Symmetry: D3
């Protein structure tokens, strides 16, 4: 399948040097990287990233942090890559994260949870369009596509 | 002590360079490697659509025999759930595989099946009897 | 918080060269190493028991092993470090332990399960005091704390 | 000294052979700072510029075909001697001469599939960086670890 | 590219749980594994394996020991490979090995130097012929061969 | 023969940059034996003394300040050649020189912040072990793998 998910390294992940590890885990799974960019999100951008929230919202902080510095944003392609991406990442809240997952291994606070994954197929479609220009998605074939899948 | 399991890296694990990574995970767990062969399976050896004979015998595999307490289940825990979609991160199929069709390794379902599977793949001879210098650190 | 826990690398764990490995999983989750030392337990040091304690199936030689070579004792600090600490160690019984955890990855036998972590905030407080002069113990601020927590 | 920038690309073999995370993580953990990062397929014009040098075939039209036959990952890194240090991290250009521990030392066999490139000087770095990235793709930020890494 | 070497994990490496690690290093390099087996050398085989002695009674010691328990034996194929393999191993003498190499990372003592690789293409084929029956030797094509070479 | 003992310290930059585990783990994997291990915060005197063949330098005041600025992790490792081996694992004292594969090679950029320390001689080690530790903190044990590492 050519299903795609959007994966970001939040600025706390870039700050504590987890960009490479994160990409590597997706690469090791057999998912394919079709878009990669480092950019510091707008306040505007950050606001739409969160679009929910809330009572307590703040919120305003989760916007401040998210545009505090660089994120590495990604597009990953493969069968069940949206689902499978979420599993790779772990529970949103690191305290509820399984060990051997990104948050499971490398994160404590839900408020500093290292990375982002789309939760649904449509959520990814929206998200990729938002972060990446069509021309920044590279269409290519893995020499290994027939060893991962049939 | 002294239960033995059979593990194999399928052609897709061997192609994708996961032989060291699988072996290493078994070694650090404290299990003892007892037999090791790279071979290309031949047509017949397909055990029970009906691709998986073009596939399972299209390229070399690494067969292995491992030894230790709970090694049937523990081994299969190590590989994780047969279906990569069900496999969890930290496990071989969880970390490395996507498709049931291309699930990298294999692990014997019962103590029973293990010995059928060892016998099938190995002469009782290719099978090395040694004692780990760590046996006393890993076990009581 | 700020909550502290007690982690020990058991003699089999030291013997099997898992000290760096263990330390590193905690450093990498974001927990903070607040005290650390190698020692050989004395036999009444040994546990002491008083966990069980009511000694109990066959203490005699569980307390003989725990005292038979060196262990590495450590105190890590952070939110839920007590609970999360146990998570990294994995299920007390190696056979229940998930791959991705210290015991899951490295341990086969309960009698030789590499490590111990305090079982509650309360057990910790005690074990920390029993193992550590209250001053072998460093108060420092991680340059990463703002990145690990909001 | 510390704001020095260098250009590092994982080449199309490296992307294919799934070594993007491997290489990036070697840089992050040396203490260097990721200042830009993207994925692109080089265009034939981008590919010819990369290898102007040789033209002068040798494997010109070949190298150009290869380098623009799939995605590469470009990056800009920043740190003290990051230009010199990057290349040390990547290993000697000819993999046959590179030492284990280095990217090419660990994962590469023949020079025409040497997995990556790094800028060879302050002045070639600055050029390549200017070449591959619009200046608004260079993110300007401070590592919370910069004082741990430098005096 | 056709050129093949013999690589052996000596009994210390097998004992010290270094078999997967060594294999991994050759897979990651791009070399192809065209044969593999575990066996316990006889004194005869260990005696042959050593050109060597002649002695200083470290022969005999080498000869025992080497037949002390199982070795893991391998044949690797890549644009040779014999040289490149030895480079992955590190200087035969561990005191001279650099970090990054197998012996660099794991060996201290020449008598326990973990592993072996043939010193020449001709030496290689003796060793391959000596250790392997010509049909224990799968000819196959790595799906990556075109990414590791031109 | 030996046996033989050296002193390895993770500098406070190394502790800060979460590399205690990684460093210990290299010594373990190498066959060396860890016979003492504690974390402590160096006092100005201890700091001042460590940077002794260095007391008449521009940096020093800053090095002392830094070394006592927060916790270090001190170790005593035992095994044949360990003083020289321990430093090879560590890599050239100045990062710009150290090779990938080594601790400073993989993880450090500048001398001020070079992460770790190993005694330079058999004698230095013995000064440093006696200084940083007390005999009773120095365990005496035998590794089950000792026979596998040494012939």
């Amino acid at each position: 399948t050519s299903e795609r998910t959007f994966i970001a390294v939040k600025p706390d992940g870039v700050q504590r040097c987890l960009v490479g590890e994160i990409i590597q885990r997706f690469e090791k799974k057999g998912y394919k990287l079709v878009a990669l960019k480092m950019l510091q999100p707008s306040a505007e951008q950050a606001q739409q990233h969160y679009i929910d929230l809330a009572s307590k919202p703040f919120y305003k902080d989760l916007v401040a942090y998210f545009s505090s510095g660089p994120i590495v944003g990604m597009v990953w392609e493969g069968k069940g890559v949206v689902k499978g991406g979420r599993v790779l990442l772990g529970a949103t809240n690191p305290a509820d994260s399984l060990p051997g997952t990104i948050r499971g291994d490398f994160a404590v606070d839900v408020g500093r949870n290292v990375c982002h994954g789309s939760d649904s197929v449509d959520s990814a479609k929206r998200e990729i369009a938002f972060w990446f220009k069509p021309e920044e998605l590279v269409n290519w074939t893995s020499h290994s596509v027939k060893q991962v899948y049939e």
